[PDB]
Design an enzyme around this catalytic site. Sequence first.
Site, PDB file in Angstrom:
ATOM      1  N   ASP A  73      -0.860  -8.040  -0.638  1.00  0.00           N
ATOM      2  CA  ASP A  73      -0.540  -6.005  -0.339  1.00  0.00           C
ATOM      3  C   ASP A  73       1.032  -6.208   0.384  1.00  0.00           C
ATOM      4  OD1 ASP A  73      -1.189  -3.450   0.258  1.00  0.00           O
ATOM      5  OD2 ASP A  73      -2.161  -3.646   1.944  1.00  0.00           O
TER       6      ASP A  73
ATOM      7  N   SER B  26       3.694   0.948   9.191  1.00  0.00           N
ATOM      8  CA  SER B  26       3.925  -0.121   8.701  1.00  0.00           C
ATOM      9  C   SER B  26       4.587  -0.584   7.774  1.00  0.00           C
ATOM     10  CB  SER B  26       2.442  -0.405   7.024  1.00  0.00           C
ATOM     11  OG  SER B  26       1.799  -1.374   7.373  1.00  0.00           O
TER      12      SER B  26
ATOM     13  N   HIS C  68       0.272  -1.224   0.030  1.00  0.00           N
ATOM     14  CA  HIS C  68      -0.203   0.119   0.088  1.00  0.00           C
ATOM     15  C   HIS C  68       1.062   1.381  -0.081  1.00  0.00           C
ATOM     16  CE1 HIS C  68       0.880  -2.099   4.559  1.00  0.00           C
ATOM     17  NE2 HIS C  68       0.463  -0.697   4.156  1.00  0.00           N
TER      18      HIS C  68
END
Lengths: 52, 162
Positions: free
Chosen positions: B62, B114, B40
């Site tokens: 992802d 992340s 992402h």
Amino acid sequence: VSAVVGMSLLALISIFASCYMLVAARSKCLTPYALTPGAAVPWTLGILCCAP
Amino acid sequence: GKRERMCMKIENDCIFEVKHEGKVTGYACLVGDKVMKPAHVKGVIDNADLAKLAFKKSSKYDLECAQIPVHMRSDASKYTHEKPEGHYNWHHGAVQYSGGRFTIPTGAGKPGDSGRPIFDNKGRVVAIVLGGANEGSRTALSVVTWNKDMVTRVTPEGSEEW
């Protein structure tokens, strides 16, 4: 002439679509093994598909 | 203490950062003999050698993977696959795992954090953080595991993509 051209074009697009979708099926079947750290593809699946 | 110092010592060399518009927006990690990079986040990795390397992509999971060259072969992260229950280390505190789920205390996970891996008690890496969802004083985690040979994603309801 028109009929032959159309038939050849239809055959070509059918062949291309089938080949591309089979390639996509291969790439989607063997995609997770390239993401797993370590490990290795089974020899059988690495034979029925060319596994780097 | 000493454990914090050694965690920092690894993090100064193993986990990298991605940047965009002069701002860091994602972290990429080197686990085993591959690279993990949640898909992402977009940007340029702050490393000349890795950026030139060609990547791979899968929007289903992802993440973006690759193969490391032979000049960071020693800078590995000692992967593992066992998941006993207990407490697990992270850069933003200790995370505990129970019932097949990862739990964090409330707002210890921040937006844009992340890609940081989790560490077990022996220091091995077990999962990569992707996003979180909160309920009460605890927040659930959406992470990807390395069960045997196939990676598996587990996501709670209403997960916020960090």
